[PDB]
Amino acid sequence: DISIYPTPKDMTVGNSEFTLEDSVNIVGLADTYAFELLKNMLTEIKINESEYIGESDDNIEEMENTLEEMNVDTSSISKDEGYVLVTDENKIVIRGNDETGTFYGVKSLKQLIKKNKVILDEVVIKDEPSFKMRAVVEGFYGTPWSQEERLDQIKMYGEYKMNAYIYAPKSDPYHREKWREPYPASELDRMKELIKTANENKVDFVFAISPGLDIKFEGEEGEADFKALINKAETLYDMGVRSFAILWDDIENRSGVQQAEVLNRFNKEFIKNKEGVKPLITVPVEYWGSSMFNGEEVKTYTKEFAETLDKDIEVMWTGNDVIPPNGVSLEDAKKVSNVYNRKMMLWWNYPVNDYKEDKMALGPIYDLDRNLDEEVSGFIVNPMRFSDASKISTLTGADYGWNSVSYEAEKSWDKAIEIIAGEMKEEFKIFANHSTRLDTGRPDSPEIKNTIDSLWEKWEAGSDISLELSNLQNEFSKMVQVPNKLRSNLENKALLNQLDSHLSKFEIYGNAGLKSIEILQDIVNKDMSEFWSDNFEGIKLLRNLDGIKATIANNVVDPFIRKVH
Burial pattern 37-49, b for ≥16 Cβ within 10 A else e, equals: bbeeebeebeeee
Strand partners, 88: 91
Question: Do 314 and 282 form a contact (C-beta atoms < 8 A)?
Answer: yes
Burial pattern 373-409, b for ≥16 Cβ within 10 A else e, equals: bebbbbbbbbbbbbbbbbbbbbbbbbbbbbbbebbeb
CA 474 to mean position of chain CA atoms: 32
242 vs 196, 199, 245, CA distance in Å?
A: 12, 10, 11
Name residues whose C-beta falls within 8 Å of residue 547's C-beta, 6 or more positions apart in sequence: none
* Rounded (10°) angle between helices 387-402 and 409-421: 140
Strand partners, 136: 165, 381
Q: Does residue 84 sit in helix, strand or coil?
A: strand
Question: Do 386 and 492 form a contact (C-beta atoms < 8 A)?
Answer: no
Name residues whose C-beta falls within 8 Å of residue 453's C-beta, 6 or more positions apart in sequence: none
What does residue 421 show for φ and ψ, rounded to 5 degrees? -110, -15
Which one from 10, 80, 214, 250 is the annotated catalytic residue? 250
491 vs 344, 388, 486, 507, CA distance in Å?
A: 39, 12, 9, 20
Name residues whose C-beta falls within 8 Å of residue 165's C-beta, 6 or more positions apart in sequence: 135, 136, 137, 138, 150, 153, 154, 157, 198, 203, 204, 205, 206
2 vs 7, 138, 166, 186, CA distance in Å?
A: 11, 33, 32, 47
Question: Do 204 and 163 form a contact (C-beta atoms < 8 A)?
Answer: yes
- Runs of H (alpha helix) within 111-255: 147-159, 188-200, 219-239
Strand partners, 85: 94, 125
206 vs 203, 271, 281, CA distance in Å?
A: 9, 13, 9
CA 284 to mean position of chain CA atoms: 22
Q: How far apart are CA 396 and CA 423, in angstroms?
A: 19
Asked if residue 351 has a cis previous peptide bond (ω within 30° of 0), the answer is yes
DSSP 50-71: ---EEEEE-TTT--HHHHHHTT
250 included as an active-site residue: yes
Residues taking part in catalysis = 250
